[PDB]
Structures are given as structure tokens and as C-alpha cells.
Design an enzyme around this catalytic site. Structure first.
Site, PDB file in Angstrom:
ATOM      1  CG  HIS A 250      -0.335   0.257   2.508  1.00 19.96           C
ATOM      2  ND1 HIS A 250       0.332  -0.724   3.211  1.00 19.96           N
ATOM      3  CD2 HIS A 250      -0.288   1.371   3.279  1.00 19.96           C
ATOM      4  CE1 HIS A 250       0.759  -0.228   4.360  1.00 19.96           C
ATOM      5  NE2 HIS A 250       0.396   1.041   4.424  1.00 19.96           N
TER       6      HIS A 250
ATOM      7  CG  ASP B 170       0.447  -4.397   2.795  1.00 22.14           C
ATOM      8  OD1 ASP B 170       0.614  -3.898   1.659  1.00 22.14           O
ATOM      9  OD2 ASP B 170       0.490  -3.754   3.860  1.00 22.14           O
TER      10      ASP B 170
ATOM     11  CB  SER C 236       2.707   1.800   6.362  1.00 21.72           C
ATOM     12  OG  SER C 236       1.440   1.799   6.990  1.00 21.72           O
TER      13      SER C 236
HETATM   14  N1  LIG Z   1      -0.098  -0.859  14.074  1.00 18.82           N
HETATM   15  C1  LIG Z   1      -1.138  -0.136  13.705  1.00 18.82           C
HETATM   16  N2  LIG Z   1      -2.200   0.001  14.503  1.00 18.82           N
HETATM   17  C2  LIG Z   1      -1.125   0.525  12.318  1.00 18.82           C
HETATM   18  C3  LIG Z   1      -0.168   0.121  11.337  1.00 18.82           C
HETATM   19  C4  LIG Z   1      -0.158   0.714  10.052  1.00 18.82           C
HETATM   20  C5  LIG Z   1      -1.105   1.718   9.727  1.00 18.82           C
HETATM   21  N3  LIG Z   1      -1.100   2.298   8.450  1.00 18.82           N
HETATM   22  C6  LIG Z   1      -2.058   2.135  10.691  1.00 18.82           C
HETATM   23  C7  LIG Z   1      -2.069   1.541  11.981  1.00 18.82           C
END
Ligand SMILES: NC(=[NH2+])c1ccc(N)cc1
Ligand SMILES: [Zn+2]
Length: 223
Positions: free
Chosen positions: A41, A86, A177
């Protein structure tokens, strides 16, 4: 990174950063002198990867290379099922040096084991609400495949695994991410997703199950 700390200056030499205009949107992992691993993503027609950086200041970092690239291969099975598979491999426009602040890491040979304490780093939103200045560090353990599959049903897929979710509210968040999740010195997974807000007790974050793509990553690089 929520409830983390300042990583030791260049303690994660494989950490990479993906930047768009003037901001930072994703992280990555140097798995090869010419290849960066990240979350699908985070796809972009063209990239700008920052290596060997404790802070996003290429100037304050004598040993850092802001390389570029444009060739990026997303997993053929990305988002099918939704959120699944992903991961993505970004090929650098040029190899990189092997220095003391920039080093590639190897992908976990075996798969995650519950309770196994791991470590995740990134520049995403801090425990409070903002963007940090230096790479953040937080420790989170793996959750049994049972608890994970049930907690995220039906989104849960074998190509993912949960970590964290403890009462120390340690977790990942937007901007992290693609970041790397290390266990026993190996790259076990990558920051993928999780229920918002971040840091909810009992709601561990989900990561990419790299152990299930060791064959694909290799195959893709050697062609
Ligand atoms: N670890 C998480 N809660 C998380 C990871 C990636 C993201 N884009 C949003 C939240
Ligand atoms: Zn430095």
C-alpha cells in the site's frame, strides 16, 4: 510508533524511508544493496529512499544516501483477500555501499512464535499525536495465531501475523507502514495495519508474514 523511545543513533541500519513531496509517508527495509522491501500500500510510480538516517535530516547525517528508484514490484496477490499479501520490493537505481550506518538485513528463515519479543522501528505518529524527529523504537511480542485469527476475522490471512496488543499500549501507527519488525536479529515482518486508534489494549497490530514469501522475494530479485 506509540509509546516507544528514541532508537540508539543508527541502531537499525537497515531502516529506510519513503518520501513524497516534502513529507515522509512510509518506511522500508534494505534486504539487498539494490533492493528495498516495503508494504504494497506504499506503492509509488517513483521513489526517493533515505538510508542511514537517524533523523530525516540528510545534512545532519554525514553518512546517508538519498537514493532514488522507479521499479517496484507489488505482490501479485496484494489485497486479495483484502489487506492480504501486503508486501512489495523496490529496486534501487543504484547499489549501495555497505557502511556502518547502512546495512542490509536477512529475512526470517522460520515463522513467528507466540510470546516471542520483537522490535519495531519507524517515524510514524508518536504516542501523542505527532511526527517524531528521530527514528522511534518499541518492543512488542507475537500473539498466538489463534487469538490473532479470531480477533481480526475475517480479514486475517496466513500472510499476516499480530504483535503487541499488550497493556503497555505499545504499537505501530500511520507512517510506520512498511517499517521493519525484527525478531532474533531477523526481519520477521513489516508494518501492515491495525484497528484505530493505535495502542488499544487487546488489539495487536498486524504485520506482513515475510516467512511466507522468502521464496517469492528471492525469485523476484534473481531474474
Ligand atoms: N499498528 C497499527 N495500529 C497501524 C499500522 C499501520 C497503519 N497504516 C495504521 C495503523
Ligand atoms: Zn547520525
Amino acid at each position: 510508533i506509540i509509546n516507544g523511545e528514541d532508537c540508539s543513533p543508527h541502531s537499525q541500519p537497515w531502516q529506510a524511508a519513503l518520501v513524497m513531496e516534502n513529507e515522509l509517508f512510509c518506511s522500508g527495509v534494505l534486504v539487498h544493496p539494490q533492493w528495498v522491501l516495503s508494504a504494497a500500500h506504499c506503492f509509488q510510480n517513483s521513489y526517493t529512499i533515505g538510508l542511514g538516517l537517524h533523523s530525516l535530516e540528510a545534512d545532519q547525517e554525514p553518512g546517508s544516501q538519498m537514493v532514488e528508484a522507479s521499479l517496484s514490484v507489488r505482490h501479485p496477490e496484494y489485497n486479495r483477500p483484502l489487506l492480504a499479501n501486503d508486501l512489495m520490493l523496490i529496486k534501487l537505481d543504484e547499489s549501495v555501499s555497505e557502511s556502518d550506518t547502512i546495512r542490509s538485513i536477512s529475512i526470517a528463515s522460520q515463522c513467528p512464535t507466540a510470546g516471542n519479543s520483537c522490535l519495531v522501528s519507524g517515524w510514524g505518529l508518536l504516542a501523542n499525536g505527532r511526527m517524531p524527529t528521530v527514528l522511534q523504537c518499541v518492543n512488542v511480542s507475537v500473539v498466538s495465531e489463534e487469538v490473532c485469527s479470531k480477533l481480526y476475522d475475517p480479514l486475517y490471512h496466513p500472510s499476516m501475523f499480530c504483535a503487541g496488543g499488550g497493556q503497555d499500549q505499545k504499537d505501530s501507527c500511520n507512517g510506520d507502514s512498511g517499517g521493519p519488525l525484527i525478531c532474533n536479529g531477523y526481519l520477521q515482518g513489516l508494518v501492515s495495519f491495525g484497528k484505530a486508534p493505535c495502542g488499544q489494549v487487546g488489539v495487536p497490530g498486524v504485520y506482513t508474514n515475510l516467512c511466507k514469501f522468502t521464496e517469492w522475494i528471492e525469485k523476484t530479485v534473481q531474474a
